[PDB]
Design an enzyme around this catalytic site. Structure first.
Site, PDB file in Angstrom:
ATOM      1  N   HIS A  88      44.407  37.235  21.523  1.00 32.71           N
ATOM      2  CA  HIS A  88      44.307  37.014  22.983  1.00 32.71           C
ATOM      3  C   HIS A  88      43.183  37.879  23.526  1.00 32.71           C
ATOM      4  CE1 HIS A  88      47.987  34.630  22.985  1.00 32.71           C
ATOM      5  NE2 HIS A  88      48.536  35.602  22.201  1.00 32.71           N
ATOM      6  N   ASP A  91      39.507  37.294  30.677  1.00 37.02           N
ATOM      7  CA  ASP A  91      38.285  36.927  31.452  1.00 37.02           C
ATOM      8  C   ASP A  91      38.679  37.040  32.934  1.00 37.02           C
ATOM      9  OD1 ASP A  91      36.186  35.213  32.937  1.00 37.02           O
ATOM     10  OD2 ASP A  91      36.412  33.562  31.450  1.00 37.02           O
ATOM     11  N   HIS A  93      37.273  36.324  36.565  1.00 42.35           N
ATOM     12  CA  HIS A  93      36.225  35.673  37.378  1.00 42.35           C
ATOM     13  C   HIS A  93      35.660  36.640  38.424  1.00 42.35           C
ATOM     14  CE1 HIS A  93      37.485  31.176  36.692  1.00 42.35           C
ATOM     15  NE2 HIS A  93      37.334  31.814  35.522  1.00 42.35           N
ATOM     16  N   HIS A 128      42.075  34.769  33.238  1.00 40.24           N
ATOM     17  CA  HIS A 128      42.737  33.941  32.193  1.00 40.24           C
ATOM     18  C   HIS A 128      42.314  34.364  30.787  1.00 40.24           C
ATOM     19  CE1 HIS A 128      39.244  31.320  31.392  1.00 40.24           C
ATOM     20  NE2 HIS A 128      39.031  31.369  32.705  1.00 40.24           N
ATOM     21  N   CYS A 129      43.123  33.989  29.808  1.00 39.67           N
ATOM     22  CA  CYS A 129      42.810  34.202  28.383  1.00 39.67           C
ATOM     23  C   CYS A 129      41.707  33.187  28.014  1.00 39.67           C
ATOM     24  CB  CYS A 129      44.090  34.080  27.566  1.00 39.67           C
ATOM     25  SG  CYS A 129      43.817  34.460  25.826  1.00 39.67           S
ATOM     26  N   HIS A 139      45.176  28.158  25.521  1.00 35.18           N
ATOM     27  CA  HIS A 139      45.851  29.385  25.991  1.00 35.18           C
ATOM     28  C   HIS A 139      46.055  29.292  27.518  1.00 35.18           C
ATOM     29  CE1 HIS A 139      45.613  32.346  22.449  1.00 35.18           C
ATOM     30  NE2 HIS A 139      45.326  31.119  21.959  1.00 35.18           N
ATOM     31  N   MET A 144      48.456  31.316  30.250  1.00 29.34           N
ATOM     32  CA  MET A 144      47.750  32.635  30.275  1.00 29.34           C
ATOM     33  C   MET A 144      46.703  32.673  31.386  1.00 29.34           C
ATOM     34  SD  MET A 144      47.646  33.987  26.365  1.00 29.34           S
ATOM     35  CE  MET A 144      47.448  35.657  26.980  1.00 29.34           C
ATOM     36  N   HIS A 249      49.399  21.928  50.810  1.00 33.23           N
ATOM     37  CA  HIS A 249      49.783  21.441  52.150  1.00 33.23           C
ATOM     38  C   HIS A 249      51.130  22.076  52.488  1.00 33.23           C
ATOM     39  CE1 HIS A 249      50.478  18.762  55.531  1.00 33.23           C
ATOM     40  NE2 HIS A 249      51.668  18.540  54.992  1.00 33.23           N
ATOM     41  N   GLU A 273      45.099  20.685  57.709  1.00 33.39           N
ATOM     42  CA  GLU A 273      46.381  20.027  57.335  1.00 33.39           C
ATOM     43  C   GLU A 273      46.571  20.286  55.830  1.00 33.39           C
ATOM     44  OE1 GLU A 273      46.440  15.419  57.564  1.00 33.39           O
ATOM     45  OE2 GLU A 273      44.189  15.693  57.836  1.00 33.39           O
ATOM     46  N   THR A 274      45.534  20.048  55.049  1.00 34.08           N
ATOM     47  CA  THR A 274      45.550  20.077  53.574  1.00 34.08           C
ATOM     48  C   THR A 274      44.250  20.724  53.131  1.00 34.08           C
ATOM     49  OG1 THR A 274      46.946  18.130  53.487  1.00 34.08           O
ATOM     50  CG2 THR A 274      45.689  18.679  51.476  1.00 34.08           C
ATOM     51  N   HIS A 300      49.361  17.918  47.665  1.00 36.87           N
ATOM     52  CA  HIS A 300      49.498  16.625  48.384  1.00 36.87           C
ATOM     53  C   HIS A 300      48.960  15.436  47.565  1.00 36.87           C
ATOM     54  CE1 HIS A 300      50.475  13.959  51.613  1.00 36.87           C
ATOM     55  NE2 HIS A 300      50.978  14.956  52.303  1.00 36.87           N
TER      56      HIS A 300
HETATM   57  O1  LIG Z   1      43.426  32.964  19.635  1.00 37.23           O
HETATM   58  N1  LIG Z   1      43.848  31.770  19.669  1.00 37.23           N
HETATM   59  O2  LIG Z   1      44.765  31.041  19.153  1.00 37.23           O
HETATM   60 CU   LIG Z   2      45.750  33.987  24.840  1.00 36.85          CU
HETATM   61 CU   LIG Z   3      52.128  14.790  54.062  1.00 34.71          CU
HETATM   62 CU   LIG Z   4      37.355  30.833  33.786  1.00 39.45          CU
END
Ligand SMILES: O=N[O-]
Ligand SMILES: [Cu+2]
Ligand SMILES: [Cu+2]
Ligand SMILES: [Cu+2]
Ligand SMILES: OC[C@H]1O[C@@](CO)(O[C@H]2O[C@H](CO)[C@@H](O)[C@H](O)[C@H]2O)[C@@H](O)[C@@H]1O
Ligand SMILES: OC[C@H]1O[C@@](CO)(O[C@H]2O[C@H](CO)[C@@H](O)[C@H](O)[C@H]2O)[C@@H](O)[C@@H]1O
Ligand SMILES: OC[C@H]1O[C@@](CO)(O[C@H]2O[C@H](CO)[C@@H](O)[C@H](O)[C@H]2O)[C@@H](O)[C@@H]1O
Ligand SMILES: OC[C@H]1O[C@@](CO)(O[C@H]2O[C@H](CO)[C@@H](O)[C@H](O)[C@H]2O)[C@@H](O)[C@@H]1O
Ligand SMILES: OC[C@H]1O[C@@](CO)(O[C@H]2O[C@H](CO)[C@@H](O)[C@H](O)[C@H]2O)[C@@H](O)[C@@H]1O
Ligand SMILES: OC[C@H]1O[C@@](CO)(O[C@H]2O[C@H](CO)[C@@H](O)[C@H](O)[C@H]2O)[C@@H](O)[C@@H]1O
Ligand SMILES: O=N[O-]
Ligand SMILES: O=N[O-]
Ligand SMILES: O=N[O-]
Ligand SMILES: O=N[O-]
Ligand SMILES: O=N[O-]
Ligand SMILES: O=N[O-]
Ligand SMILES: O=N[O-]
Ligand SMILES: O=N[O-]
Ligand SMILES: [Cu+2]
Ligand SMILES: [Cu+2]
Ligand SMILES: [Cu+2]
Lengths: 341, 341, 341
Positions: A88, A91, A93, A128-129, A139, A144, A249, A273-274, A300
């Site tokens: 694993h 990352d 962002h 995320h992984c 993943h 993840m 929504h 609204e959305t 929605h």
């Molecule tokens: O590291 N991935 O299965």
């Molecule tokens: Cu992972």
């Molecule tokens: Cu609606």
């Molecule tokens: Cu990403």
């Protein structure tokens, strides 16, 4: 010890709740220390008890929300216990360089790693992984992924010089799942993530999820786990989707102030609204509740919301405002003298 | 009679046309009275004559556009005639509380209900049926959705202190349909909505529509039902999608001023080629026609536009401007002395 | 010769590179002359050597980027050599009238046509083939699409009175492909576009691509064809998708300034993680690289990115900034005295 700033350990909490933090701060930059432990485990993801081989940060889908301020340094210990079967990594962002940290954090079961990144960009961001190649989407759609919020040091503003303050904050992580079926259409069960992989990859290739869930299962944030608020409270709802677009929504409400791209350097839009969370991003919406009762928070695409699991509930306490809305006449028989063509 | 304002009855018209209204008004707030009658009926939805079990507000897909001004009260009589087979209700995304009104408007066949909501938020908004649980997406994708437009009392502006006025307004409701097929791939027919439900729900679960139509059928707004305009006219196009994202594009034109999230408290974007309506929302685009001829209005997934039914036509009268565009040389044989590698 | 402006011939280059141009100019309006030659040919589109019957402008997917300035006239010679089997035309989303030029440019094999349009709207815009009816989506998803960039005469700005200048520009055309499979799931091969049509149309109808590629094939912009940059360089990335939504993300970076709707009359958004290109549009993102190394540029549907081909690489030369990011502790065994529950 090149970097001589105060250090502060943060204890993460399980979504949809968020660890204790300040909105506006006059403290200088700190080193904010976070620990994330990878846990592979079978999890229940729907109201019929369907299971699937999940991979998580800290045992939850989504992973916990991390909250820091612009200019802080974020020091993350990632732990991959030897009970896990796969490598694993993580990352961010929010981070700059080395594929968000993925290139510096790859760990085998039995290993840990410490990454530090400077929080130079404000907003809510996905983490995320991302091990490499086809392992990346596998993943992420196995669970993840999480989010980090980098607040401005002065807290939120409406982009026109007025401060915005939330009374409450919830983190809604939306997850698209790809559960294999047998020839009769029943969901298949596996004894390990590795055994599930080949069948799961075939479902992933057709780009249609079998389930779309908030907080890791259909019905997770309904019934007794409904989200609480009060009339008059300004509630911040952070929404993330690491892989697929979502269109949040609040049924019976609005987004008073919405950052749909999730970045606080941009003025929010008003009275939506959305709104639209693009796959691989987090957004945020502020609403001030005006009426008590039950609110459904949905994507929605109503097929996904009602039939694939993507509905949460708010239970809002307070007094009904008959000026905003009223039932003038309760359901009654259509009058005999009526023409309705 | 707690609420002592003048009352004004509005007669709705069938889309894509819009009932008579003022853009800017100096009248005070009124109670605007609207009547919607639910009609379940078999409808033709494609050029090969495919039928399906529709459920509508006022006998049309979409339901009619309702136009009011900020601060008006909207008093809606919803009627479910005893010829219908199911309960129905209505949810206004423009309204505050009780799931948009859905929690106050559930009516059995033979019943009517009167709901009043205050129009506190400007923009175009979706309204749709939402009975409960899996019935929600089924009634919406069966055709039970429309839009309401809440204008500012001063009419539209460009967000930089200049008034915008339309010469003409059209409402384009986009509908995603899920029509079941037999083993040979032919569309199946049913004698009631209830008989269609189980097969339709299976198509809905795979999140791929069989048809995507404007104004309730493939070709509805082409040929003799093309939309009319003139060179120089500012035309407002209101676009709604209650369930699925759309990407409207006027072929040979632009969006001069576009509210893609559909809310007039936000300044429009300028000079768009293609804009984005998120599922569960309405947007609006203003264009001033500069050239005569045929324009195609599409969702710019061109597979949906050309093969699943989502194309409308404008026929624009006027004089051609050779400065903006000209054919310098008509199709001709490639010259012998040409090299084209 | 009604139009008495200087003429300038432009030589197009193959994507992802862009022909020589000025950002800011004090030259007056010119007639900018471009030639596009249609080429139908079999092309390889994935790393396993899958082929498919492509139709292109100038032998490339995407077609080349054309760069002009606001107020220029764009004079395009479209050539359909007699080796081709079908009629073709061209629609410029940047142009006003005659379906973008499609109604004035339909040419049989053996023919050419000259269209002139005035560049009155700034931004990046899609151009694509659009013969008529079902041929429209088929020619576009067979590869007949590109982009044009209309710069302001003063070049780019941040929408708040500051000039923006790029050191480098790349054009990333994203293509959704629909390759038919046999009963065993292997991709089918055909000897002509016409032979492929009927099977391809069936895949197109289910709205799920088999491949999603940058620059015409899986892996086109990885390995030796990685995009080059340096720490400190401001890089403009133009992204187009003629048929389907995309969500671009620079892994380990950001969008400093993003026009996601692609129109320079609108101020860019700042500090985006992931942005959204609506099907039928082009957008643009400016980033200043801050760290050296490998960056992946993806659509952040990670299934499409990792498994259907939509990943590009930047190789960035320079010195690592340990203040922005550092590995505090390399992977190491979890300490014996650790508790990780
Ligand atoms: O590291 N991935 O299965
Ligand atoms: Cu992972
Ligand atoms: Cu609606
Ligand atoms: Cu990403
Ligand atoms: O607003 C565009 C701007 O982003 C910049 C700031 O000038 O950098 C971002 O990331 C940098 C990381 O060191 C910081 O200077 C800054 O705090 C952050 O917003 C530039 O790269 C660019 O002009
Ligand atoms: O979806 C195909 C087909 O499978 C059945 C069981 O044979 O139900 C499965 O799929 C349903 C929809 O996902 C789930 O509600 C259920 O948990 C699962 O067994 C049929 O009911 C259905 O038509
Ligand atoms: O702009 C954010 C703002 O929306 C508010 C107005 O202050 O309320 C919206 O709905 C209210 C309903 O009573 C009205 O006050 C107002 O007209 C409308 O825009 C607040 O809840 C919030 O500050
Ligand atoms: O789409 C599958 C398959 O079914 C056939 C009839 O056997 O056509 C049906 O579907 C078409 C596409 O939706 C429609 O044009 C038509 O109305 C319907 O009969 C085949 O033509 C097709 O391959
Ligand atoms: O900003 C809205 C505006 O677009 C206008 C300019 O006033 O026209 C666009 O296309 C025209 C083509 O002749 C040009 O006047 C102009 O340069 C361009 O932006 C109007 O139609 C409208 O007000
Ligand atoms: O995708 C269905 C099925 O087909 C097989 C071959 O029998 O592989 C094909 O499809 C794969 C995914 O698109 C490609 O990688 C390959 O090029 C193609 O032969 C099976 O592997 C797969 O389950
Ligand atoms: O330094 N005071 O928070
Ligand atoms: O497991 N999710 O909260
Ligand atoms: O009160 N006049 O419209
Ligand atoms: O039935 N629709 O206009
Ligand atoms: O009320 N629903 O069928
Ligand atoms: O006229 N000078 O570029
Ligand atoms: O063929 N594409 O670069
Ligand atoms: O011109 N179309 O095949
Ligand atoms: Cu209904
Ligand atoms: Cu063509
Ligand atoms: Cu187009």
């Amino acid at each position: 010890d090149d970097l001589k700033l105060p250090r502060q350990r943060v204890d993460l909490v399980a979504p949809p709740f968020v660890h204790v933090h300040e909105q506006a701060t006059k403290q200088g930059p700190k080193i904010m220390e976070f620990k994330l432990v990878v846990q592979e485990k079978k999890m229940v993801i729907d109201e019929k008890g369907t299971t699937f081989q999940a991979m998580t940060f800290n045992g939850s889908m989504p992973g916990p929300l991390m909250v820091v301020h612009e200019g802080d340094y974020v020091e993350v210990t990632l732990v991959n216990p030897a009970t896990n079967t796969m490598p694993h990594n993580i990352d961010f962002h929010s981070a700059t360089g080395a594929l968000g940290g993925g290139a510096l954090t790859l760990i085998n079961p039995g290993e840990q790693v410490v990454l530090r990144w400077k929080a130079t960009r404000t907003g809510v961001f996905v983490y995320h992984c991302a091990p490499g190649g086809p392992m990346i989407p596998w993943h992420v759609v196995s669970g993840m992924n999480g989010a980090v919020m980098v607040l401005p040091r002065d807290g939120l503003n409406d982009g026109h010089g007025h401060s915005l303050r939330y009374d409450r904050i919830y983190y809604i992580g939306e997850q698209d799942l790809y559960v294999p079926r047998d020839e009769k259409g029943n969901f298949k069960s596996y004894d390990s993530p590795g055994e599930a992989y080949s069948d799961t990859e075939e479902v992933m290739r057709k780009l249609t999820p079998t389930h779309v869930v908030f907080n890791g299962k259909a019905g997770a944030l309904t019934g007794k786990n409904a989200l609480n608020a009060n009339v008059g409270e300004n509630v911040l709802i952070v929404h993330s989707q690491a892989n697929r677009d979502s269109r949040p929504h609040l049924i019976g409400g609005h987004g008073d102030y919405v950052w749909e791209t999730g970045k606080f350097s941009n003025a929010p839009e008003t009275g939506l609204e959305t709104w639209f969370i693009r796959g691989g991003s987090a957004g945020a919406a502020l609403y001030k509740f005006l009426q008590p009762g039950i609110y459904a928070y949905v994507t929605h695409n109503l097929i996904e919301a009602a039939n694939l699991g993507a509905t949460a509930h708010f239970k809002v306490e307070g007094k009904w405002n008959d000026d905003l809305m009223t039932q003038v006449k309760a359901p009654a028989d259509i009058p005999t003298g009526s023409t309705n063509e």
